[PDB]
Amino acid sequence: NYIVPGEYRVAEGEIEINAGREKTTIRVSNTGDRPIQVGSHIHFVEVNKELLFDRAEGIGRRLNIPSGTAARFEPGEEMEVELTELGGNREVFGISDLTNGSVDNKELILQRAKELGYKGVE
């Protein structure tokens, strides 16, 4: 009976994000001495050079977290994160300039990443 002006009455259930897309869990470490925070929609292979992880496993992917949230790595901190697949045309331009085209070009992306010192290229 009490009226909260403008209140919501939400439906039952839950919302599944990024439904139907492959998910991948990887370990990532901040080898730097300042904190690194990573948003939900950055192409994961293009994050800060000083994050150490299997860079190939970030290609064509991003964090599987709610839109507009982030994962925070304090200095020296290692965490497991879950990635989802990029959608749409599966192309990335700009950011760190590692892709500039289809994410399918894994060898080129990794060659650029290695030459520029992004940690974790095999």
């Binding site: 730097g32 300042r34 904190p35 690194i36 925070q37 990573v38 948003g39 950055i42 293009e46 994050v47 800060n48 050079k49 000083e50 982030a70 950011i95 760190s96």
Partner: peptide, 10 residues
């Protein structure tokens, strides 16, 4: 600020 794609030196 986040140092997401790089630190100051980047």
């Amino acid at each position: 600020t986040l140092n997401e794609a790089g630190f100051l030196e980047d």
